[PDB]
Design a protein around this ligand. Structure first.
Ligand SMILES: Nc1nc2c(ncn2[C@@H]2O[C@H](COP(=O)(O)OP(=O)(O)OP(=O)(O)O)[C@@H](O)[C@H]2O)c(=O)[nH]1
Length: 333
């Protein structure tokens, strides 16, 4: 290299795109374990919990037992205030774990005491250290009771204050995607949706695909993404891409009017035969549903184990104006 280049290269050393995924509580730890095992690209995994038992069986690059003094390696018994206090007690440890992150993804299942209470604290620390802060959480199933939903919605309001983009997945809508879903599989299905949303979002940024995804562009869209919801579709039919995206756009997970969306993140995943043209069609389709002024970030990657199905992850941002937060859940205005 040359003097100019050598300098630049060194610059590239300091600069980067450090991404960290933080799973709080049992549901959050379960998600992290999966990401670590199946291997998530270009991202560090961090699991935190008050419950030492759940944490020890979890798998991640780093684990943080929060609230030692407060809970003594025990769970929060459903009390969000314990999770919040616990996270505060361990702020320094959490800070050390996500310290040099350019972007932090916070994931958990809202409704319990740990995830609900600590997620907002992790988010506050994430922004204070200057990282693009994104949350991807789930709301509980109706069958879990109103207390769990209230605590979740309150935690959702608190989280909303400290995140740059808050992606919310309504577990209850999973029953609209698979009507005859056996209760014993309800959480195994939610698990699948959570992983696809988080891994899908993370890899859209870190995984090499048929087209480059610029981190700066991702920042611009998510810096003020506000409240976001997802849509998931997949098809192996003649018009794989067309059907997949149609499924995503009509997904019950995307429970809101999207015409008033400020932006979107689109991740097209398919087998080795996936072309840029299919991905283009997915994006073209989505763009016609959103405001003509919305910013759309998209990518297309190859998923080794897909065979001949194309999957589409959609993330519509800035829909807070079309949603209302109630103690019973999210309601479309
Ligand atoms: N996908 C998924 N969601 C889960 C699972 N377990 C529970 N949930 C959901 O996540 C919410 C919070 O549960 P946990 O993560 O177990 O709770 P916690 O944050 O650890 O809180 P405490 O046990 O009170 O300390 C529940 O209300 C369910 O909606 C799981 O295995 N997978």
């Amino acid at each position: 290299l040359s003097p100019e280049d050598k300098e630049l290269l060194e610059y590239l050393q300091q600069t980067k795109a450090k991404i960290t995924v933080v799973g709080c509580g049992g549901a959050g730890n379960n998600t992290i374990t999966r990401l670590k095992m199946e291997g998530i690209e270009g991202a560090k995994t961090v699991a935190i919990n008050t419950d030492a038992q759940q944490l020890i069986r979890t798998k991640a690059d780093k684990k943080i037992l929060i609230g030692k003094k407060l809970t003594r390696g025990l769970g929060a018994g459903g009390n969000p205030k314990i999770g919040e206090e616990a996270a505060k007690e361990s702020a320094e440890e959490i800070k050390a774990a996500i310290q040099d992150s350019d972007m932090v993804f916070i994931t958990c299942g809202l409704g319990g005491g740990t995830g609900t209470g600590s997620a907002p604290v992790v988010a506050e620390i994430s922004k204070k250290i200057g990282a693009l802060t994104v949350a991807v959480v789930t709301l509980p199933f109706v069958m879990e009771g109103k207390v769990r939903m209230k605590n979740a919605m309150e935690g959702l309001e608190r989280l909303k204050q400290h995140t740059d983009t808050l992606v919310v997945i309504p577990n209850e809508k999973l029953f609209e995607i698979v009507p005859n879903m056996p209760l014993k599989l309800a959480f195994k299905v939610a698990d699948e949706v959570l992983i696809n949303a988080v891994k899908g979002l993370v890899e859209l940024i870190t995984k090499d695909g048929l087209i480059n995804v610029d981190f700066a562009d991702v920042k611009a869209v998510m810096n003020n993404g506000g409240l976001a919801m997802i849509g998931i579709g997949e098809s192996d039919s003649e018009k794989r891409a067309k059907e997949a995206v149609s499924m995503a756009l009509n997904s019950p997970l995307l429970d809101v009017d999207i015409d008033g969306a400020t932006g979107a993140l689109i991740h097209v995943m398919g087998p080795e035969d996936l072309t840029l043209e299919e991905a283009r069609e997915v994006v073209a389709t989505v763009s016609s549903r959103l405001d003509p002024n919305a910013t759309i970030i998209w990518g297309a990657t190859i998923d080794e184990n897909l065979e001949n199905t194309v999957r589409v992850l959609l993330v519509i941002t800035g829909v807070q104006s079309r949603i209302e937060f109630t103690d019973t859940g999210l309601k479309r205005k």
